Amino acid sequence: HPALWVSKTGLDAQQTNIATISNNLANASTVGYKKSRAVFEDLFYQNINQGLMLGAGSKVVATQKVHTHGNAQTTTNALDMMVEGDGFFQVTLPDGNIGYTRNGQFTLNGEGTLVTSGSGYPVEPEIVIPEDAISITVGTDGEVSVRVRGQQDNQVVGQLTITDFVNPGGLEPIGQNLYLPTGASGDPQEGVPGLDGLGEIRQSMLEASNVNVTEELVNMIEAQRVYEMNSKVISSVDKMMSFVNQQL
Amino acid sequence: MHPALWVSKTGLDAQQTNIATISNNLANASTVGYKKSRAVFEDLFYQNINQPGGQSSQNTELPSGLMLGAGSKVVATQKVHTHGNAQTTTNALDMMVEGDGFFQVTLPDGNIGYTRNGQFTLNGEGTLVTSGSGYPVEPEIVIPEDAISITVGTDGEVSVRVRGQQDNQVVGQLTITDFVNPGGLEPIGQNLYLPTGASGDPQEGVPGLDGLGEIRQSMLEASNVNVTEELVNMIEAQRVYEMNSKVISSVDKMMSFVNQQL
Amino acid sequence: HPALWVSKTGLDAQQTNIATISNNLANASTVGYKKSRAVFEDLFYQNINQGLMLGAGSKVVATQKVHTHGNAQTTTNALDMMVEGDGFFQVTLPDGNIGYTRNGQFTLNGEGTLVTSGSGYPVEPEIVIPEDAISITVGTDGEVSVRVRGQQDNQVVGQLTITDFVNPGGLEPIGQNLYLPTGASGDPQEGVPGLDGLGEIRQSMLEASNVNVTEELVNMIEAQRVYEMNSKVISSVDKMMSFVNQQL
Amino acid sequence: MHPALWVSKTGLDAQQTNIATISNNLANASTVGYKKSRAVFEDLFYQNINQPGGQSSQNTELPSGLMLGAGSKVVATQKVHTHGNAQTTTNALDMMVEGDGFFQV
Amino acid sequence: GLGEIRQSMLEASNVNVTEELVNMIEAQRVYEMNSKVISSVDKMMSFVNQQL
Amino acid sequence: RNGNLKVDQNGMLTNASGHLVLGENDAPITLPIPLSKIEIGRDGTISVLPQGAPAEEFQAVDRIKLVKPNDQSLFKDTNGLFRHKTPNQPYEADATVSLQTGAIEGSNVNAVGEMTALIDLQRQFEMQVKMMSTAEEMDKSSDSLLRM
């Protein structure tokens, strides 16, 4: 019976949709997180009793990352920074290839290299903080400098660079607030952080999650009811088929 | 076979198609820009049994003029292209047509498909493509890599904000297509429709003049399915399905009685 | 079974009513927004045993706009103005025709033309503010004059006019706080505001929405119960028909 | 699923933007030379089920039609560039523009 | 003896929703009861032409 | 009585079954091709809005031909269309019939009435079949007259 499996597509589509909604609400406190919306599209149509068109159901075809900039969180840490605009921080993965992140919670390793606060991947290009530094300053263009006692003027230890993608929604998330460039993402466009469409580095600031907690709660309401509605079609079809073979 | 058995079977087949039509309507209750379909029923051809010819008006109220129907069938699955509600989104690339009009996308085989869904995005080259299979949107619109924001006017004017230059740069303009009979478009899935003879030749134009709809940025059109219509339709279709089954069961026992008694 | 659809009309009619209630509640902060009420009417009655009358249900036949003057909001902005009385502002649509608005939140574009604070459509008649002006004054009869340093007396830059209709409820809403004239709206009666039944222009003041939030919440209560009341009949008819074919 | 669900959803989004606008006004209550902002509400399109003024029967037309709204949204954030008060200081390098104009950096 | 015209007031319907639901219950059960008689007559006659 | 109307690409107004709908001229109703708003009047009047025209350019184009003849003088044809029993009798257009637009009329089959007549047909059918069996039983018995 086609109605059994047409409604099963609706149940599968809602189950995928609810999973993405729960992912958004789970990452409501993750720094630099971009929410996602499931994209619904109807399946193919069959021309039966040939000019009569019957649908095959629906499915979730893709999950679209909405890369809208989140709010600003002011912190007293001197190593967590935020990109004010378009751009990603680039880090070095253990595989050797570069991953791209929007979470700016950084720190230092034992040797002074600027690394991520989680797994500890180094940040490209390498920035090394000397042991004699008493303060670390990151300029609006990625110019990292440190203060040394007995020496007027901050010495420059390096300059950070950020990467922008034409289609950030095409990036492949691999967890840990990291992305991998893909075919549809585009060509990684590096450069000085603050020129040619790139964002500006904001030291001692963090980018909040852009999820809308109220929207996801309403989306749960509409996803739950449609899920229940398709269950009744399956139940009614079961009663119809149980009636036919019992009656006949 | 016994004609009474096949008359009820046609009603069983007709209601099954109606049930499947309802099931797809409820399945696509969240699909953006989905138009609900309804099933239309009609009575089959009426045959004169007691007349050697076809003189139906002769004695139609007498036994010689008795005419028996051949059952029922679903003549068509009609599309109802009513305007759906509005979903205000924060994405800058999903858009809605308010009123008459269709977005035009380029199919892989070469022709152009038409859709009411406006969930768009960019590919690696900056071309405005759909967020599903990624088909380019007609006319081709390319977003420069230096743009910091994207603005879509009510007439399809797509503008970008580039740092350095004052005033926004125009990168192109969108167009939408209207059809004389929207119900004549054949659905091919992927939220896409194809023009047919029953629909008419596409009438392209600027989105907002000549009666076309206006483009609304950061908005989406929800499906117009009525979740209560389908449930009420399910109730009637289930009952009609069971009533015709009893006729089939009744005819079976009557035929069983004849060859068991005689 | 006719009882299924008579109740089903009540369900669709109540759904239409609830949609109008939510629209009023959604636009509880919209400036110059007029609340709406759905109008119910019974469908045709039939003679069945020819002196027996049976109705066909009910439907929402119209949604009436309540054009009652709302309260006044005192703002310090000098470009948001309110029509005190009867009349509408006139804006220039991109199509070239004139749309009528009661939302008076206006502003200037890059050249000095008085345009709406939203889409930016120019206001008819055209008013252009010279760049040397230091303050903008709008008279109670639409007289617009500016203050120029080095010259005694405010110079007049133009005059505002408002359009009145015999039946404001016949105006077709097109969104964006805009209306369009129809055959039942009446004849556009232009004129100097404050004269011959027209309202007065009040600068630095705004008209609040005339929605009664308490009424909408009560209207939801009676619409929800009647909606649930009709669903019980459909359930009862479904059980009755399920009993007949299970018994007969 | 239900028209009221979508209509009210637009209202929730409208108020969240409006509340976010007010929060920035109070956050920048001590910022020198800050201009407050006001959110501009506007209704969405209307579903034209029955055209108001359309001809009903003959020599009769609907005075009002069946048109259903779609909700509301915040379309603009209007800055009120009115002149603020004056703070007198002892520093000789903090200046104020007395009227219209902007410092350029 | 005619009534008066009251402006800005509307006459609500005089339906009693609870009364209709109570009448719905009684009409539903009576509907089922008559179907029981029809089934009983059919089963009685079915016994005749089968047994006899 | 199938009021499920539709408009094709040429503008002809047909119903769900493909039958052309007649008008005042007694010819099938044809509308202008680029429509933007079609409203059916209470008395069958068809008022359209040309594409791009303002809301005040509402004009009627045709009128649905509604006929109210004597019901007992009609017979259902082989294709479900009711016609006059007397051939070559014109269908006079009635000015009293009203159309409730925005709705579709279903069938008037009384499902319970059909079922309670089905159970009667079964019993009467089976009783006559028993008469057939008792007819051959009598013949077999009377066949012993000639046996000797």
mmCIF file of all heavy atoms in Angstrom, chain C residues 183-200:
data_model
loop_
_atom_site.group_PDB
_atom_site.id
_atom_site.type_symbol
_atom_site.label_atom_id
_atom_site.label_comp_id
_atom_site.label_asym_id
_atom_site.label_seq_id
_atom_site.Cartn_x
_atom_site.Cartn_y
_atom_site.Cartn_z
ATOM 1 N N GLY C 183 -13.123 49.868 -5.404
ATOM 2 C CA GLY C 183 -14.423 50.385 -5.798
ATOM 3 C C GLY C 183 -15.313 50.703 -4.610
ATOM 4 O O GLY C 183 -16.097 51.656 -4.648
ATOM 5 N N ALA C 184 -15.209 49.911 -3.545
ATOM 6 C CA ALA C 184 -16.016 50.114 -2.351
ATOM 7 C C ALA C 184 -15.365 51.040 -1.335
ATOM 8 O O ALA C 184 -16.015 51.403 -0.348
ATOM 9 C CB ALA C 184 -16.320 48.768 -1.683
ATOM 10 N N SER C 185 -14.105 51.423 -1.542
ATOM 11 C CA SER C 185 -13.452 52.343 -0.616
ATOM 12 C C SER C 185 -14.059 53.735 -0.712
ATOM 13 O O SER C 185 -14.322 54.385 0.306
ATOM 14 C CB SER C 185 -11.952 52.390 -0.896
ATOM 15 O OG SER C 185 -11.310 53.309 -0.032
ATOM 16 N N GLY C 186 -14.285 54.210 -1.927
ATOM 17 C CA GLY C 186 -14.868 55.508 -2.163
ATOM 18 C C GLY C 186 -14.025 56.295 -3.140
ATOM 19 O O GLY C 186 -13.195 55.736 -3.857
ATOM 20 N N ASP C 187 -14.247 57.607 -3.162
ATOM 21 C CA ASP C 187 -13.489 58.507 -4.018
ATOM 22 C C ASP C 187 -12.405 59.180 -3.196
ATOM 23 O O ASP C 187 -12.700 59.704 -2.111
ATOM 24 C CB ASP C 187 -14.404 59.554 -4.651
ATOM 25 C CG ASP C 187 -15.523 58.935 -5.464
ATOM 26 O OD1 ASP C 187 -15.302 57.861 -6.061
ATOM 27 O OD2 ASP C 187 -16.627 59.521 -5.504
ATOM 28 N N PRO C 188 -11.152 59.182 -3.650
ATOM 29 C CA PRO C 188 -10.090 59.859 -2.890
ATOM 30 C C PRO C 188 -10.361 61.350 -2.782
ATOM 31 O O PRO C 188 -10.357 62.076 -3.780
ATOM 32 C CB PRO C 188 -8.828 59.568 -3.712
ATOM 33 C CG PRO C 188 -9.172 58.368 -4.535
ATOM 34 C CD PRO C 188 -10.629 58.500 -4.843
ATOM 35 N N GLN C 189 -10.598 61.808 -1.556
ATOM 36 C CA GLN C 189 -10.888 63.214 -1.282
ATOM 37 C C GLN C 189 -9.632 63.865 -0.715
ATOM 38 O O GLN C 189 -9.371 63.793 0.488
ATOM 39 C CB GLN C 189 -12.067 63.350 -0.324
ATOM 40 C CG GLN C 189 -12.390 64.788 0.056
ATOM 41 C CD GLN C 189 -13.571 64.895 1.002
ATOM 42 O OE1 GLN C 189 -14.726 64.827 0.580
ATOM 43 N NE2 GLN C 189 -13.287 65.066 2.287
ATOM 44 N N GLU C 190 -8.848 64.494 -1.586
ATOM 45 C CA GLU C 190 -7.701 65.263 -1.137
ATOM 46 C C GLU C 190 -8.152 66.616 -0.595
ATOM 47 O O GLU C 190 -9.285 67.058 -0.805
ATOM 48 C CB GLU C 190 -6.698 65.459 -2.274
ATOM 49 C CG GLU C 190 -6.003 64.189 -2.738
ATOM 50 C CD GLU C 190 -6.847 63.371 -3.696
ATOM 51 O OE1 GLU C 190 -7.977 63.796 -4.012
ATOM 52 O OE2 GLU C 190 -6.374 62.303 -4.138
ATOM 53 N N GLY C 191 -7.250 67.274 0.110
ATOM 54 C CA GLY C 191 -7.535 68.583 0.662
ATOM 55 C C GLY C 191 -6.545 68.940 1.747
ATOM 56 O O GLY C 191 -5.785 68.106 2.236
ATOM 57 N N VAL C 192 -6.566 70.212 2.118
ATOM 58 C CA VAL C 192 -5.703 70.690 3.202
ATOM 59 C C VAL C 192 -6.158 70.060 4.512
ATOM 60 O O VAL C 192 -7.345 70.170 4.867
ATOM 61 C CB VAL C 192 -5.745 72.216 3.280
ATOM 62 C CG1 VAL C 192 -4.838 72.716 4.393
ATOM 63 C CG2 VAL C 192 -5.348 72.825 1.947
ATOM 64 N N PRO C 193 -5.275 69.391 5.252
ATOM 65 C CA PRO C 193 -5.700 68.750 6.502
ATOM 66 C C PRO C 193 -6.231 69.770 7.497
ATOM 67 O O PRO C 193 -5.766 70.909 7.559
ATOM 68 C CB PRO C 193 -4.420 68.075 7.008
ATOM 69 C CG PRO C 193 -3.311 68.784 6.322
ATOM 70 C CD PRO C 193 -3.843 69.189 4.986
ATOM 71 N N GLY C 194 -7.225 69.346 8.274
ATOM 72 C CA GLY C 194 -7.900 70.212 9.215
ATOM 73 C C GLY C 194 -9.108 70.935 8.658
ATOM 74 O O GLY C 194 -9.786 71.642 9.413
ATOM 75 N N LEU C 195 -9.396 70.781 7.368
ATOM 76 C CA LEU C 195 -10.496 71.475 6.714
ATOM 77 C C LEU C 195 -11.461 70.465 6.110
ATOM 78 O O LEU C 195 -11.033 69.507 5.457
ATOM 79 C CB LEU C 195 -9.979 72.418 5.626
ATOM 80 C CG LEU C 195 -8.957 73.472 6.053
ATOM 81 C CD1 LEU C 195 -8.496 74.284 4.854
ATOM 82 C CD2 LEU C 195 -9.537 74.378 7.126
ATOM 83 N N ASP C 196 -12.759 70.687 6.333
ATOM 84 C CA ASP C 196 -13.827 69.931 5.677
ATOM 85 C C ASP C 196 -13.749 68.441 6.010
ATOM 86 O O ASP C 196 -13.659 67.585 5.128
ATOM 87 C CB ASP C 196 -13.805 70.159 4.163
ATOM 88 C CG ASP C 196 -15.149 69.897 3.510
ATOM 89 O OD1 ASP C 196 -15.920 69.065 4.031
ATOM 90 O OD2 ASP C 196 -15.438 70.528 2.471
ATOM 91 N N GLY C 197 -13.784 68.132 7.306
ATOM 92 C CA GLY C 197 -13.832 66.764 7.768
ATOM 93 C C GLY C 197 -12.503 66.045 7.812
ATOM 94 O O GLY C 197 -12.467 64.870 8.203
ATOM 95 N N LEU C 198 -11.413 66.699 7.424
ATOM 96 C CA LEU C 198 -10.103 66.072 7.454
ATOM 97 C C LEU C 198 -9.461 66.224 8.828
ATOM 98 O O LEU C 198 -9.822 67.094 9.624
ATOM 99 C CB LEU C 198 -9.189 66.674 6.385
ATOM 100 C CG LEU C 198 -9.359 66.150 4.961
ATOM 101 C CD1 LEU C 198 -8.375 66.820 4.022
ATOM 102 C CD2 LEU C 198 -9.174 64.650 4.946
ATOM 103 N N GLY C 199 -8.488 65.357 9.098
ATOM 104 C CA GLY C 199 -7.723 65.435 10.320
ATOM 105 C C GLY C 199 -6.648 66.502 10.249
ATOM 106 O O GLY C 199 -6.512 67.235 9.272
ATOM 107 N N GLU C 200 -5.869 66.588 11.321
ATOM 108 C CA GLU C 200 -4.782 67.549 11.427
ATOM 109 C C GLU C 200 -3.455 66.816 11.539
ATOM 110 O O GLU C 200 -3.379 65.738 12.138
ATOM 111 C CB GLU C 200 -4.974 68.472 12.632
ATOM 112 C CG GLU C 200 -6.179 69.387 12.526
ATOM 113 C CD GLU C 200 -6.387 70.216 13.776
ATOM 114 O OE1 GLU C 200 -5.924 69.791 14.855
ATOM 115 O OE2 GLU C 200 -7.009 71.294 13.680
#
